[PDB]
Amino acid sequence: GNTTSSVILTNYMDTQYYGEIGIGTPPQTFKVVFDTGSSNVWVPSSKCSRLYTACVYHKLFDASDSSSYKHNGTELTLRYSTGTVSGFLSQDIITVGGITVTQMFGEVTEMPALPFMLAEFDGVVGMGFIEQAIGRVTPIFDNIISQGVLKEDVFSFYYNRDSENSQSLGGQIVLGGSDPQHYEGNFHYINLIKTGVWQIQMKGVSVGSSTLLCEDGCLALVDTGASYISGSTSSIEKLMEALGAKKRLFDYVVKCNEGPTLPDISFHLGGKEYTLTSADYVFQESYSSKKLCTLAIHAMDIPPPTGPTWALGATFIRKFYTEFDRRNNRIGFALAR
Ligand SMILES: CN[C@H](CNC(=O)N1CCC[C@@H]([C@@H](OCCNC(=O)OC)c2cccc(Cl)c2)C1)C[C@H]1CCCOC1
Ligand SMILES: *[C@@H]1O[C@H](CO)[C@@H](O)[C@H](O)[C@H]1NC(C)=O
Numbered sequence: 178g179n180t181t182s183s184v185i186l187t188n189y190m191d192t193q194y195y196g197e198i199g200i201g202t203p204p205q206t207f208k209v210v211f212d213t214g215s216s217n218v219w220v221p222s223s224k225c226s227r228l229y230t231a232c233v234y235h236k237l238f239d240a241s242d243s244s245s246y247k248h249n250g251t252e253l254t255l256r257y258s259t260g261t262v263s264g265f266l267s268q269d270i271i272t273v274g275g276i277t278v279t280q281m282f283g284e285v286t287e288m289p290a291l292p293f294m295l296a297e298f299d300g301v302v303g304m305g306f307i308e309q310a311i312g313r314v315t316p317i318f319d320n321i322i323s324q325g326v327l328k329e330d331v332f333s334f335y336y337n338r339d340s341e342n343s344q345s346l347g348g349q350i351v352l353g354g355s356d357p358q359h360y361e362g363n364f365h366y367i368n369l370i371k372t373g374v375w376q377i378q379m380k381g382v383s384v385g386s387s388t389l390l391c392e393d394g395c396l397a398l399v400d401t402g403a404s405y406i407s408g409s410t411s412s413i414e415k416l417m418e419a420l421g422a423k424k425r426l427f428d429y430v431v432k433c434n435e436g437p438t439l440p441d442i443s444f445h446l447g448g449k450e451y452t453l454t455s456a457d458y459v460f461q462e463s464y465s466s467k468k469l470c471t472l473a474i475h476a477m478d479i480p481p482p483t484g485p486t487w488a489l490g491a492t493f494i495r496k497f498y499t500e501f502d503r504r505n506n507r508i509g510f511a512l513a514r
């Protein structure tokens with residue numbers, strides 16, 4: 178096999194990146210987030226009651242309208258950081274890119290307003306391992322590896338900075354490989370800690386000159402479904418104090434005028450420094466000293482077994498094109514352009 182497919186992604190405000198899949202015959206279209214921190218596929222169901230305002234406001238999958246659809250009906254409940262969704266399993270043909278696979282996915286029938294009323298996407302396509310898939314359902318990239326059509330057993334993410342230009346490419350997933358148009362130089366590869374989670378070892382996090390955090394090592398999940406960088410409550414407090422940031426209800430902020438001269442934050446990964454400047458981590462809506470600007474960094478206490486861990490989300494990926502490699506169990510980073 179030597180096929181590599183591409184899916185264009187929409188970038189909504191540098192916090193939601195999502196692309197299209199088609200389910201059924203004829204294809205029903207869904208906006209989905211490709212999430213390396215999870216491993217199940219789901220979209221909203223036609224059987225989702227109106228009582229779920231979130232079901233009113235998203236695209237629904239109608240089993241009746243698809244000839245390839247095969248019933249299963251087994252209960253499914255998926256819990257994320259954002260909330261819980263539930264429904265049942267269905268099987269059908271899913272297209273992503275030029276690739277068609279038969280897949281088991283969740284038809285969601287309970288979808289809470291918090292926070293799905295704020296999702297610009299309809300569902301999630303988990304790119305994690307079967308070890309994390311609820312119901313041990315075979316993940317879509319695993320069903321794609323099976324077809325043997327892919328040039329290499331890897332996928333990769335380019336996430337762009339949101340642009341006013343009507344033309345800006347919001348982002349791009351490649352199945353089968355990486356697109357040299359969106360990264361410079363060569364990949365630096367880091368080995369997974371273990372198969373089952375896209376998580377690597379991290380040697381420290383430094384803010385400025387001083388190695389402030391994770392001084393004796395810690396973990397980093399590379400999470401394409403995460404908008405921000407996240408660390409544990411106790412690390413983030415330390416980081417935010419170092420930056421003179423203020424915690425609010427939904428976010429952390431800084432005086433907008435102060436943002437540009439805030440220190441770099443570096444992540445020490447596979448012997449190298451991955452550095453994010455304040456231009457990569459502050460949302461500079463203005464530079465006014467009477468306005469507060471949000472940082473693209475927050476606290477998330479991810480529970481064992483996968484946490485405690487940092488998570489490197491779009492804030493980080495924006496800068497570093499990311500290749501997720503299943504064949505060799507490793508992740509490669511190169512400078513995004
Ligand atoms: C395990 N991977 C995801 C972890 N994401 C997160 O924890 N957050 C922190 C809370 C808000 C989330 C944001 O998602 C945007 C998509 N993501 C992304 O475009 O990335 C670059 C979000 C914002 C608003 C509404 C909703 Cl439902 C979600 C991001 C699991 C996510 C995957 C998507 C469903 O929710 C679970
Ligand atoms: C649906 O999923 C359960 C999980 O494998 C399985 O036992 C069952 O055979 C499948 N249901 C049907 C109706 O085929």
Ligand SMILES: [Cl-]
Binds near residue numbers: 250265
């Ligand atoms: Cl059912």
Ligand SMILES: [Cl-]
Binds near residue numbers: 215
């Ligand atoms: Cl889950």
Ligand SMILES: [Cl-]
Binds near residue numbers: 389390391392
């Ligand atoms: Cl720490």
Ligand SMILES: [Cl-]
Binds near residue numbers: 191457458473492
């Ligand atoms: Cl940013």
